[PDB]
Design a protein around this nucleic acid. Sequence first.
DNA 1: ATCGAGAATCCCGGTGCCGAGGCCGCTCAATTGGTCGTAGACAGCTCTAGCACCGCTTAAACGCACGTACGCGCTGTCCCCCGCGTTTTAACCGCCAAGGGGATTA
DNA 2: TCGGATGTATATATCTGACACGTGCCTGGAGACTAGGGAGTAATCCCCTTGGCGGTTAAAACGCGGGGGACAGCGCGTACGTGCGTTTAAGCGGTGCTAGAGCTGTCTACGACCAATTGAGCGGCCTCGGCACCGGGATTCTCGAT
DNA 3: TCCCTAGTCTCCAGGCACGTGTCAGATATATCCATCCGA
Lengths: 106, 104, 97, 98, 78, 81, 93, 91
Amino acid sequence: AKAKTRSSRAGLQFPVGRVHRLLRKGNYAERVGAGAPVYLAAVLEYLTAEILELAGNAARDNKKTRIIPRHLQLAIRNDEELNKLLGKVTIAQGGVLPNIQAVLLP
Amino acid sequence: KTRSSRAGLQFPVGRVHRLLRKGNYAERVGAGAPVYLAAVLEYLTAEILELAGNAARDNKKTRIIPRHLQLAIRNDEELNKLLGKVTIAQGGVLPNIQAVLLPK
Amino acid sequence: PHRYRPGTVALREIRRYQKSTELLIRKLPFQRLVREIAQDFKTDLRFQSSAVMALQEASEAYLVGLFEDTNLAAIHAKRVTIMPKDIQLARRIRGER
Amino acid sequence: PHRYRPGTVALREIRRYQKSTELLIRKLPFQRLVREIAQDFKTDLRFQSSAVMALQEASEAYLVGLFEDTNLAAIHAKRVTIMPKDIQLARRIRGERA
Amino acid sequence: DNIQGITKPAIRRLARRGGVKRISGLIYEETRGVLKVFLENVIRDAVTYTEHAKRKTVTAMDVVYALKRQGRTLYGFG
Amino acid sequence: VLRDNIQGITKPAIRRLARRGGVKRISGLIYEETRGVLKVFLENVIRDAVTYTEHAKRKTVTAMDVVYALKRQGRTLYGFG
Amino acid sequence: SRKESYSVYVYKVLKQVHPDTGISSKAMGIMNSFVNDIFERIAGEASRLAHYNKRSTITSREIQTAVRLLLPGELAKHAVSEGTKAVTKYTSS
Amino acid sequence: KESYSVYVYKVLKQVHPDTGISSKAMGIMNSFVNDIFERIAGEASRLAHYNKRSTITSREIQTAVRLLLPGELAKHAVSEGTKAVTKYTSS
DNA sequence: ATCGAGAATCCCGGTGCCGAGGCCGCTCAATTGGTCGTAGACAGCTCTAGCACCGCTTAAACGCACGTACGCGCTGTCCCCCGCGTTTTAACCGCCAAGGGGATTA
DNA sequence: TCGGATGTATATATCTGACACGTGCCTGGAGACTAGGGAGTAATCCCCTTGGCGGTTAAAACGCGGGGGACAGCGCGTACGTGCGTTTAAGCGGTGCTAGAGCTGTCTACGACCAATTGAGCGGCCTCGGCACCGGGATTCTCGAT
DNA sequence: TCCCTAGTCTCCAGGCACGTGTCAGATATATCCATCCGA
C-alpha cells in the first residue's frame, strides 16, 4: 500500500519510528504507547530548534555562517532556561562566557 | 531449600531476584545476580547497623533511633561519602563548632 | 542582676540545638506556608500530614546545610557574623543561583 | 622602556582567553600525567587518543569553573589575589572534600 | 503572607543548629525568600506527580520523589 | 614507570586557566593546590574509566569510557562519542 | 557496523530555522549528544512515572509529565504545547 | 507491602544481639536498602546496555558495586558478594 | 585637564585549503495489514483520613532597654607577585616502523 | 584567682506505649521440567595505538626591579546579643463529616507480533566556497608627561 | 553451539496481617558539680 511516514503524519522533522524503536529497545517499560514517540519526537524537535535558533543568531553576531561549538556554548549560557537545563553539561571546545568581575576593573 | 540459606545470606535472594525481574532493568536476569546483590546489600546493612549499635552503646541506650544512624553515617568517612546527598529525617546533625567562634 | 557576656548563650544554644533532633519550626505555620505555595499550582490540593512533615524535614535539612556553608563563608571573610552576602555566595557556589 | 602597570596585562589576556576556545595546557605533559595516574589502577593501559582529549577537556572545564568559584570567594574576602584558602573554601562549599 | 510565620527565632534556631554565633538582621528576610524558592521548587514537582496519578491529595511519596529528583534524597518516609 | 609528571602542568598553564576563569592576580601557593586538585579529579575520573574498560574485557580506554565516567559524577561531556 | 545519528534531522531543523546557516562537524556531534541526553533523561523520567503508578505502558501522558518535570519554566510550557500539537495531528490521520 | 524489616532485624541480632531498633529507624533502614538496591540495579542496567548485553550477571553487579561504593567499602562488598556467589554455586 | 609616543587591537584584502555539503548506490529498518492476548478505562463500592471547628493551657514570639564588641574604614609596612628581558627546552610536527587488540563472523 | 551564681550531669521513682513475641494463613518462593537463544569461545583483519628520530620554535624557567596589595593596628559607633515583661497563636484534647483514596468487576480498545514491502537514511566519493593565515594599514587604549 | 535462563505446573512454608504482655525510655524532682562573671 502507500506509506506516509509517521513523522510526516504528525508533521515533525524528527523520526517517530526511530524514537519508538529506541523506546522499545531501551527497556524503559514493558509496552510503549502510540502517541508517546510522537510526543517525544515533538519535544526533541522543539528543543533542537530552540538551540539552533540562538546558535545561528550568535553565529551572525560573530560574522560566521557556520555554527561552531563556541556558538553553541554562547547560545546555551546566554539563555536563562537553557542554561538551567544544561547547568551540569560541558560542551567540548566551547570556551567560557566572557565575564570579568567589576572589582577587578581598574 | 531457600536460596538465602543456601548462599549463607539473610536478605531474600528470591525477593531480590523478583524485583530485578520486575523492575525493568534488563531483558533477562542471571541466576548469580540476586545472590551478589543480596550479599552486597546485607554487608552494607551490617556495616550501618554495627556502627549504629556502637553509637547507641556510646549513648548508653540499647535501641537504635534515627539519631544513632545519622551519627554512624556522618562519623564514617566512606559511609558519609556513599550517602552524601541523603537526608536522614529526624536524625539531626553531627556536633561541630568552629574554632574561631570559641572564646579566649 | 547576673549578666552574661555576649556570645556565651549563643554558643550554649549551638550546643543544645546540635544535640537534638526536633524540627525548630512550628508545624502549623509551615503547613500554612506549604498550602499557600501549593495554591499556585492546583486549587484544592489536599495535603496528607505525612507529606507536610516530609517537606518540613527536607526544608529544615536544606536550611541547616545552607547555614553551615554560610557560616563557613562568613568565617572566610574574617568575620564572626553571617551576612546576606554570605548566603548569596554560598548559594552561587553550590549552584542554586 | 615602555612598561604597562601590573594590573593591566592581567585584565588583558583574561579577555582573550575568555574570547578564545583552545585548551591552554600542553598535550603531551597532560597525556603523560594521565598515564602516570592510570598505571596505578591497571598496568599497561593503552589510552585511546580521543579518551585523552576528553579527559583533558573535562579537566580544564572543571579547573576553570573551580577558578571562577575561587575568584568569587577571594573577592568575597575583600581581596583580589586568590590564595589556596579560597580554593579550599570553594571545594568545601561545592561538596568536594567535605 | 504565611512566610512571616517562619519567625525570626525559628531562623535563629536553624542558624544555631548550623553553628552560627552571630546573625545579621537582614538574614531573617533573605532566608525566608530562600526557603520560599526551595519549597516552590519542591512542591511544583510533587504536585506534578500528583497531577499524573489523577489524585487531588499530595501524598508523602510524591514529596519523596520530588526531593529525589532534585538530588536531595530523603530517608524515613518511603 | 613515570615519576611525578604533575610538574608538567606548569605554572604558566595554571595561570592561563585562571585567566580564563576570570582571575586578575594569583598567589604563588595556588599552583601546588591546583596541581593537587587536578590530580584528585583525574584519579576519580580515570578510576571509573578504567573500571568501565575492565568490565568490557578491554585493554584500551575508549573515549566513551571517559564520557560515561564523567556522566556518573555529573559532568556530562558533550561532543566526544 | 552502521552507526545511527540525528544528523539529518538536526540539519533539517537548522535549515527550517536558519535557511542560510551551516554547521560544523563538532557542533553536529554536540547536537547529537544533546538530543541523546535529553531523550535519555525524558525516557528515564517517564519510566519512573510508569513504575511509580504500577503501570506497564509509556503513554503520551507520561512523556508530558516527564517534560513538565525536567524542562524548566516557559521551556516546558512550549514543548508541551508542541507535543500536544503534534500527537493530535497524528491521531487525525 | 513488602519490606526488609525482618531481614534487617536478623542482621542486627547477628551483629548486636543485645540492641534493638525502633520503628522509625527500621523504616530508615528499609529506605536505605531500597535506595542502594535501585542504585546498583540501575547502574548494572546501564552497564548491560552499554556493552550491548541483554543480561544482568554477577559481573555487572560487581562492576556497579565497584563504581558506586567508595574504596574500602567497595572492596569489602566485592569480597562478600564473591564469597556468597561461590558458596551458592559450590553447594 | 589634557596629550602625544608607543603598544595593542581591529580592519581590509589577498591566497590557499580542507571540509561541509551535495549526489548516487545500496540497504534494512520503518510501514501495512492482519490476528490476538490483555492493561487499564470506566463504572461502582466502601472505608478512612484529611479538612473544619472549638476550647483550653501555655510555650513561644515579640517589643523594649541596654551594653558592648565587632564590623568597618583609615593608615602604615613590607613583601611578593607581576611585567619584562634573556636563556634554555621540551612541545610539536612530520615522518617511519611495528604489533596488540578491537571489531567482525561461525 | 576565689566567691557567688547560674546551667548541665546524676540518681531515683513512676507511668507508658512502642517492641518484640505467638498465631493464623496465603501467596509468593522452591523444585522439576521444557525449549530456544545470548553469549562464551575461536579465528581473522586491519587499524589504531605505541614507540622512536630529526628539525623548529613557541613556550617555560630564571632573574630583576618595583609598585600595588595583603596584612596588621586603631578608633568609633552602631547593630546585635541578653534579658524581662507582654501578647499571641501553636499544640493538643475532642467532635463532625464527607471528598476521595483505595479495592473490585466488565470488556474493549490497544499495543504486541509476525509476514510481506519499499523507500528514507547511510556510506562512499567529488568540489568549490567559507574560513584560517598573513601582510599591511587604520584605529584605540594606555602611561609617562604636563 | 551449548548451556543458561524465561516460562509453566505443582507444592508448601516462610513471611505478612493481627493480637498482647512488658520493659526501655521519657518525665518529674531533688542533688551534685562544671563553668562563667566580677572585684
